[PDB]
Amino acid sequence: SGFRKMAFPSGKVEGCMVQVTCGTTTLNGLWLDDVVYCPRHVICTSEDMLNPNYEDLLIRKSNHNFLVQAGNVQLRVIGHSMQNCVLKLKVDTANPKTPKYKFVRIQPGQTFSVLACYNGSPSGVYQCAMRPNFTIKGSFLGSCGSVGFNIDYDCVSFCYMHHMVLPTGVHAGTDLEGNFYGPFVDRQTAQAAGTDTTITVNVLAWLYAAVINGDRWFLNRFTTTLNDFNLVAMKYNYEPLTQDHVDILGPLSAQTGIAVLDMCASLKELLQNGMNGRTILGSALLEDEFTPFDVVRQCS
Amino acid sequence: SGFRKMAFPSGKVEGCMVQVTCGTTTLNGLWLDDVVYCPRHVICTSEDMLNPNYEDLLIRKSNHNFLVQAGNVQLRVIGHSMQNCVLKLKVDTANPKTPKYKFVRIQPGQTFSVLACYNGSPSGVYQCAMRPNFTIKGSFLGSCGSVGFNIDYDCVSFCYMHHMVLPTGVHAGTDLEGNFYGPFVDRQTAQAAGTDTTITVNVLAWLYAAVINGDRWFLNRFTTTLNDFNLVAMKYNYEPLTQDHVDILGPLSAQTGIAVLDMCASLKELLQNGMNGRTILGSALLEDEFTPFDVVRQCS
Structure with a gap:
């Protein structure tokens, strides 16, 4: 009886959310096995964001410049590499709460659950859809790095990671391999999303x-x-x-x-x-x- | 940016959902410490539900008549007692995933998250409100025993447990101490909910x-x-x-x-x-x- 917009149980994802700080910027990261995934623009200053050269910016970064926190545990970064638009931080400890997971890239019109977090701590969960123009209408404040997911049997299919709010107020992100959904880039410029249609x-x-x-x-x-x-x-x-x-x-x-x-x-x-x-x-x-x-x- | 209806992270509650079977009836239970909470009408047959005498029906029940399952673990019931409209099944094992919790009775117009489950397994989570007439408009199919909750700091405040669907399609339940919200009873009769108002x-x-x-x-x-x-x-x-x-x-x-x-x-x-x-x-x-x-x- 009744019909409400329902999100997947978020338990398996809550055990993977960590805090990632680089300078004055603090956003969320996904700790799977011994790798922490987060948006690569965490390494950018507000001035860098206008026209960033991520290859040059990452070369200047050191392992000790990334402060990773898992609740009360300080995770030491032993390596860092760039995966398209996703920064991958190799840490010295594997997440003991790592669920069975896979990385999927979904289609326009498909839905998924978002575990919105702030400073690596879960805040809430909600269900949304990838708009036909590859934007999503969500609730994102420090929310960068929060992930979207589905659950199939016992496997967590990660499909989305939030990156930015457009000046139009809409949200854009990537898959867990760093490829943006839509024509968007992780750069502070005016970016037009296409005409949105009804699914x-x-x-x-x-x-x-x-x-x-x-x-x-x-x-x-x-x-x-x-x-x-x-x-x-x-x-x-x-x-x-x-x-x-x-x-x-x-x-x-x-x-x-x-x-x-x-x-x-x-x-x-x-x-x-x-x-x-x-x-x-x-x-x-x-x-x-x-x-x-x-x-x-x-x-x- | 953006504004969506958001539910609390359900991780702490997922580790407490168990299956409770009595005869042909199977609904959900809440396993906190060494006690499993579930609606007492699990002991009723479909004919019993028309006019049940719960005191007499519970006396006829034995500990081995309650089949409690936690994932793949069979929980042995070593005792059973009735708490208003909530059946309390004492089991021989304390839940190792028991969170810090409390039992609260909320006011009309307050909101909470429901972890909808079927056969003791979580299905989804959604946010709803206690209507001014003490009903709730939710998504309940075998869903009896699913609980409503809020999260304050690190404590899970359980406030609701689903019991029945009225013939009007609305849902009614109790607090975790067994007291119904509103004038409803766990008996298969026509029951009028009051005129609902806007909060x-x-x-x-x-x-x-x-x-x-x-x-x-x-x-x-x-x-x-x-x-x-x-x-x-x-x-x-x-x-x-x-x-x-x-x-x-x-x-x-x-x-x-x-x-x-x-x-x-x-x-x-x-x-x-x-x-x-x-x-x-x-x-x-x-x-x-x-x-x-x-x-x-x-x-x-």
Whole structure:
């Protein structure tokens, strides 16, 4: 019963969050095995950030310039190297709380949980989605280095590490191999994120979640084709719906008895008519940060 | 930057969730020290639930009738007693992952994090609020026994344990001492929850959060009195605002430079006029599940 935005249990990730200080800058790091991962811009001064040469800046840095703290333990750095935009600090102690993990690079429209931290200490956890323009709308104050993750069986799939807030207020980051999501760079300049679109397959999954929970007023009598729907969808800044998206929604269609293209026709009428002051699952707008897998996971 | 509904890190609570089975019924339990806490209706059959006599039903139960599982460990029950509506199962092993904890009974309008579990295994975590009518709108499927909690410094304050879904779809539970929140009983009958109201002090805190994050269009030029505001508030099913509520909002007023009664005047106009198709922090309705402490915690 009920449907809320749910984050994964954060226990396995809390045991990996450490503090990393370089000069006056203090941000968060991820301590897996004997390596601490953190954004490489921790080595930059505020003046360096305008046009940094990270290769030259890192060469000037010494191992003792990085102060790593794990709760009350001071971790000695015995080596440091640069992995794209992620600084890797080799430490003399392996994390005894290291979970089974992997590094994944997710797709636009996929969701994950963020363990927001400050000074290496966990503050809270929340669920968000990678926007189609590779930004994320989160809660980031000293929050740099906080990671995004999913949990599959007993394995923690790390997929995101926060790096910066754009002047537009949106957030940008990298995967755990240091590659930025989107066209962004770790440099203090004006950076334009692309036109953001609505994750169509996520809206349809959220509409199925409403039907599963008894909220059905928006269902109509029609069907449509993928092509006819996408013509209406492109006018309202919705991502085009693919046959892969229809196949992904299959299980929800089976549980509800509502064909995917039938639900697409209901969404098509919702876009052209609006809600007329009505709500769906307690929301007055269409929610697009629940993937079809998220709905299946919570409803099962 | 940004403002999302955030839950506490769930690590300390995950190490306490166990499975409790009695007959065909399997729900969740809380393993603190050498005691496992779970709803007492686990001992009821579906026919017993219509009109249960828990004292007589518990007397017929034996220690070996309770199957407690902690991951892969079978916990032997060496004793059982009834604490109001909470069954306390004394086990032969103390939980080595027992955190520093306390049992608190919260007030209507306060928030907490729920670690939703199924068969003693954590599924997800989310933030919710105790409605003024002592119900909660959550995500509960086998979810009975999942607990709500806050974190203060290093201490886990357990405040809620889920017991049942009302036929109205709302959820009801108890504190960790077994006392129900509200007029509800652990008995399968039609139970009316009171008329629910909007947590006024939470809306005002959420409006301050919008001002802190640059969303200011709703601010007007007026002020009001507590009495004049409450006359308008009672017409729209908002809880009356007290002087204690005004004192609680003090810090947010100091950070924003907007007096509490000035913000009350802005909310008064929002209730009478609506939003006129506008959004506040990305929402088309007024959010009331952020306490003033929640806003202070996330924004600081």
